[PDB]
Amino acid sequence: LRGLYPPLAAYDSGWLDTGDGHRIYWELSGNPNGKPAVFIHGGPGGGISPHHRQLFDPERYKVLLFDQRGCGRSRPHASLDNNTTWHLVADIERLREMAGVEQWLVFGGSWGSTLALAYAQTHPERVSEMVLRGIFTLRKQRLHWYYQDGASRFFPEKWERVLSILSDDERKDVIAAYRQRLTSADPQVQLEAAKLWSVWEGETVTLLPSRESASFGEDDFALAFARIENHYFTHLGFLESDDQLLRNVPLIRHIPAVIVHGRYDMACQVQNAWDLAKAWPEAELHIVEGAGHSYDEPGILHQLMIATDRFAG
Numbered sequence: 396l397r398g399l400y401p402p403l404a405a406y407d408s409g410w411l412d413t414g415d416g417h418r419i420y421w422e423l424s425g426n427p428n429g430k431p432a433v434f435i436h437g438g439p440g441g442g443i444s445p446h447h448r449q450l451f452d453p454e455r456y457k458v459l460l461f462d463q464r465g466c467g468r469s470r471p472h473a474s475l476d477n478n479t480t481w482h483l484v485a486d487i488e489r490l491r492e493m494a495g496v497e498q499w500l501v502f503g504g505s506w507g508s509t510l511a512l513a514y515a516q517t518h519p520e521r522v523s524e525m526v527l528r529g530i531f532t533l534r535k536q537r538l539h540w541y542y543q544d545g546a547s548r549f550f551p552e553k554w555e556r557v558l559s560i561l562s563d564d565e566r567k568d569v570i571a572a573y574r575q576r577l578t579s580a581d582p583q584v585q586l587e588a589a590k591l592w593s594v595w596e597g598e599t600v601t602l603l604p605s606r607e608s609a610s611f612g613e614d615d616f617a618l619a620f621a622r623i624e625n626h627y628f629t630h631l632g633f634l635e636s637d638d639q640l641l642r643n644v645p646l647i648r649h650i651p652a653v654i655v656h657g658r659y660d661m662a663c664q665v666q667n668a669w670d671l672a673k674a675w676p677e678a679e680l681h682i683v684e685g686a687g688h689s690y691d692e693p694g695i696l697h698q699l700m701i702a703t704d705r706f707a708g
């Protein structure tokens with residue numbers, strides 16, 4: 396099984412002012428003359444990791460990685476002002492012009508696959524190839540599955556913790572209930588709910604229990620993670636219709652793509668990947684047996700490495 400390339404530092408980085416109150420952190424890794432690619436992290440509000448650099452051949456790729464508005468090293472931290480899907484799409488174009496890229500490979504998993512699709516369908520001309528993982532298209536059925544009733548049935552003991560702070564009425568609409576707390580004037584109220592929300596996800600993204608999950612409970616990370624995620628879900632991803640990302644697939648069918656999805660992905664059902672593949676025959680679908688959601692699930696990582704390697708010749 397293929398693994399990550401060796402660790403390496405970015406060769407350049409900085410903050411880009413968007414003009415509307417945001418300074419987004421970005422970095423360039425790999426070969427300044429290599430094949431251009433952009434990495435889109437998940438969440439939303441998840442942030443990039445130095446390990447995301449090791450997903451592309453150091454000798455053949457010129458990788459641009461960045462923290463989306465309000466998370467990671469992008470300022471202001473945990474900000475929900477001017478933080479929507481369409482602003483992020485604009486941010487990607489801004490970063491592309493900065494790095495002087497005319498066209499690049501879009502690598503995105505989870506919410507990153509959601510933004511990757513939104514971006515690609517808005518600027519088809521700027522996308523050379525796509526590598527998608529753990530497909531998430533933001534349909535009501537998807538949000539209901541992970542945050543109302545669905546995954547809850549596979550992790551009943553964990554789901555009870557999420558509901559522990561809600562009254563009987565609030566439990567009717569968990570997303571809405573958490574929205575109130577996450578937007579409370581009381582920082583303590585925000586943090587208590589941010590932690591519960593983030594740990595739920597942290598403990599359900601891998602087939603087997605991981606020690607990595609504990610980091611989802613870290614105060615600063617959790618605060619921005621939960622606030623931003625809940626904000627996007629409260630607004631239905633700022634899409635004009637439930638299946639926007641699926642009905643606009645015709646706009647990108649000519650683009651070479653690889654879809655990798657874990658069979659037992661509990662955050663995003665494999666049905667999403669199947670639905671996408673059905674509308675996108677050209678794409679190559681890889682359903683990884685025995686794997687969960689996370690990009691570093693052995694079998695999922697293996698397919699990701701092979702995909703980027705092949706697209707780089």
Ligand SMILES: CC(C)(C)c1nnc(C(=O)[C@@H]2CCCN2)o1
Nearest residue numbers: 437438439504505506662689690
């Ligand atoms: C693996 C990665 C860090 C990209 C990740 N983990 N979870 C996500 C998400 O985008 C999930 C999907 C529903 C809500 N948050 O993305």
